[PDB]
């Protein structure tokens, strides 16, 4: 029994990471979240959870 994509994940599949690229349109798979978008540093802030 597991929950999906609502919190930081400690259990992951065998997929290998790739170096991030910023300011370019790229396909992204961040912890199982898949999208096509431009990725930029955020001036905003996040809580630890």
């Amino acid at each position: 029994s597991f929950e999906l994509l609502h919190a930081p994940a400690t259990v992951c599949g065998p997929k290998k990471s790739t170096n991030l690229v910023k300011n370019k349109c790229v396909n992204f798979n961040f912890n199982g979240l898949k999208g096509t978008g431009v990725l930029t540093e955020s001036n905003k802030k996040f809580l630890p959870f």
């Binding site: 029994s1 597991f2 929950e3 999906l4 994509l5 609502h6 919190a7 930081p8 994940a9 400690t10 259990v11 992951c12 599949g13 065998p14 997929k15 912890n31 199982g32």
Partner: protein
Amino acid sequence: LYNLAPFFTFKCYGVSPTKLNDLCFTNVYADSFVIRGDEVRQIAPGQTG
């Protein structure tokens, strides 16, 4: 898990078995118990047994 071959039944209610490797899961818990063969159906959502 697939490699073991006792003609086991893998049923995933909210995910597909092939897709398990790709996804990253959080809050993963494994519950192990021994039941009679007829009772296997009862261990499913909303089943009365």
